[PDB]
Amino acid sequence: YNVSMRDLLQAGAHFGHQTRFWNPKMRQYIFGARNKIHIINLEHTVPALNDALNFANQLASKKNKVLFVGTKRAASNIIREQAQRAGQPYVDHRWLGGMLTNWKTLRQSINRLKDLQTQSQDGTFAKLTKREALERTREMEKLERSLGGVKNMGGLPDALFVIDVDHEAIAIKEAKNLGIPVIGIVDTNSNPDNVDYVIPGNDDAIRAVTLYASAMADAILAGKE
RNA sequence: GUCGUCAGCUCGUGUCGUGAGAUGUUGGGUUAAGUCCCGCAACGAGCGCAACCCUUUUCCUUACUUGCCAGCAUUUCGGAU
């Protein structure tokens, strides 16, 4: 399942953001800049990606759940599809402060979501009048939109696959506080200090995101054989 | 009594500060109203608001006197009988 390099060039991980927004901590990975924007070297990206995929394979074999976190408007659909394929909890939408920091409070929210889903399945929804009917349908919509992905999950994930660290900065901080490992994609503008596993490459390109998510999903599938 | 029929008040869990503390109630629409919806280190529960109470507007069921008079009958033509 290793990308082997050419797929990375064709996907376009080489591109990066403009120089003026560069983070000084990426200097080791910048290598050079062909044009005004920076060009990252995939020579370091490949081995780091392989190591991250191997660690994900080991965790999948151990059966511990891995949580995917990618929220960029371009990456939402791709990460949702890949997470559904892998059969793992996902957070496609905006991060809500306390997915991991305060799990006990989210227990009640997901319990109520499941209860209202059971209500919809049962005839009680039909028994209730139309105004309440639309109110609780709208409630279903809202909490399914907010916490739909993590409904199945019952325990904190053993690893966090983060698409874009500076964007989803809160998630990395919570993961560091808890001690849960984070494997993440980082670009030139972001800071890698708090990422346990760093695979540096472009994330804006929908097609690079598709490549990365497909690789992770393939590793998850290979796990458990 | 009054501000004043003014719209605010409280409290549960995590995060930021060495700390007293802060974050919920802030932002944009909307309403008689922190009423309702979009925003987002926040997450939801209670008291205030509203509704539950009395009266008025159309119709239905029970009730037919001491209240009523469409149909009928007698009339000192007055529902008087």
DSSP string for residues in chain A:
---TTHHHHHHTTTEEEEGGG--GGGHHHH-B-SSSEEE--HHHHHHHHHHHHHHHHHHHHHT--EEEE---TTHHHHHHHHHHHHT--EE-SPPPTTTTTTHHHHHHHHHHHHHHHHHHHSTHHHHS-HHHHHHHHHHHHHHHHHHSTTSS--S--SEEEES-TTTTHHHHHHHHHHT--EEEEE-TTS--TT-SEEEE---S-HHHHHHHHHHHHHHHHHTT-
Q: How far apart are CA A126 and CA A27, in angstroms?
A: 62
* Header resolution in angstroms: 2.4
List the structure tokens of A164.
């874009």
- C1' of B13 to CA of A105 (Å): 7
List the structure tokens of A4.
């082997």
Under 8 Å between Cβ of A58 and A212? no
Q: Method used for this model?
A: cryo-EM
Under 8 Å between Cβ of A142 and A96? no
The nucleotide lying nearest A94 (C-alpha to C1') is B40
Q: Closest CA to B43 C1' — which residue?
A: A105
Residue with tokens 């030139």: A188
Q: How many CA atoms lie within 13 A of A207 on its CB side?
A: 9
Cα dihedral sign for A133, A134, A139, A140?
Answer: positive
Cα of A20 vs its chain's centroid, Å: 27
Q: How far apart are CA A186 and CA A213, in angstroms?
A: 14
Q: How far apart are CA A109 and CA A104, in angstroms?
A: 9
- C1' of B69 to CA of A140 (Å): 65
- Which nucleotides on chain B have any atom < 7 A from a protein Cβ? 12-16, 38, 40-44
Q: How far apart are CA A69 and CA A155, in angstroms?
A: 16
Residue with tokens 């009640």: A108
